[PDB]
Amino acid sequence: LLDFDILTNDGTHRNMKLLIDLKNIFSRQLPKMPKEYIVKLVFDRHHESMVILKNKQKVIGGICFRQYKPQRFAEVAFLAVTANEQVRGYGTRLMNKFKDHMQKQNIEYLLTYADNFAIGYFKKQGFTKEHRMPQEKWKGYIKDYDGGTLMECYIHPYVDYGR
Amino acid sequence: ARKSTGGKAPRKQLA
Numbered sequence: 001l002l003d004f005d006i007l008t009n010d011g012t013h014r015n016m017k018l019l020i021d022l023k024n025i026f027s028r029q030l031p032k033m034p035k036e037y038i039v040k041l042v043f044d045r046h047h048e049s050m051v052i053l054k055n056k057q058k059v060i061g062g063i064c065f066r067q068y069k070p071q072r073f074a075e076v077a078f079l080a081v082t083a084n085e086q087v088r089g090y091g092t093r094l095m096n097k098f099k100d101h102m103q104k105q106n107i108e109y110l111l112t113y114a115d116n117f118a119i120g121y122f123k124k125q126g127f128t129k130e131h132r133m134p135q136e137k138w139k140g141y142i143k144d145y146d147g148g149t150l151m152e153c154y155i156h157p158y159v160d161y162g163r
Numbered sequence: 164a165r166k167s168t169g170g171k172a173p174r175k176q177l178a
């Protein structure tokens with residue numbers, strides 16, 4: 001039964017199976033993403049994945065992010081829940097768990113590029129189009145794409161996110 | 164970057 005764990009790319013058979021499963025969920029739910037691209041970010045050293053584990057073995061969703069610790073902000077790379085598990089509240093519970101985790105990690109802002117429907121989805125999750133975080137903080141660290149809408153979520157130090 | 168930012172793609176989740 002349901003667990004939200006931080007999946008570490010430590011070269012072990014167990015975690016590496018879970019990362020591959022999460023990666024396959026990502027490419028399935030994000031057809032516009034080059035699959036080799038999802039692989040590169042998910043298994044790079046800089047990235048982490050918080051997954052939704054059904055029991056102690058099956059991946060049904062997760063979020064791949066990258067923390068920029070000194071600057072105290074993190075970028076969401078990919079977010080998804082497997083087809084047969086969508087519309088059950090998991091995606092929202094994941095985001096809440098993520099924010100709570102980032103709060104404990106001393107992260108002040110969450111950033112994510114969004115497109116089309118995703119903008120509305122992240123708005124429901126607390127992200128906004130206007131930023132209260134200074135440009136120069138992410139500039140040079142996070143790529144500046146003109147084709148995408150950059151959204152941010154302020155993580156207040158003592159607001160109860162997650163539950 | 165050899166491949167690297169940490170990024171998405173959802174373009175209209177209604178497909």
Ligand SMILES: CC(C)(COP(=O)(O)OP(=O)(O)OC[C@H]1O[C@@H](n2cnc3c(N)ncnc32)[C@H](O)[C@@H]1OP(=O)(O)O)[C@@H](O)C(=O)NCCC(=O)NCCS
Nearest residue numbers: 029078079080081086087088089090091092118171172173
């Ligand atoms: C976005 C996503 C993670 C949400 O996860 P989830 O487990 O389905 O989330 P929830 O059940 O908490 O979502 C609740 C709401 O989202 C809507 N929703 C969830 N999946 C949906 C789908 N496939 N199509 C349309 N609406 C959907 C529900 O209708 C619901 O109603 P509400 O907005 O009035 O509350 C999931 O839809 C997904 O994996 N999408 C494809 C990947 C993607 O586009 N990810 C974000 C960008 S990388």
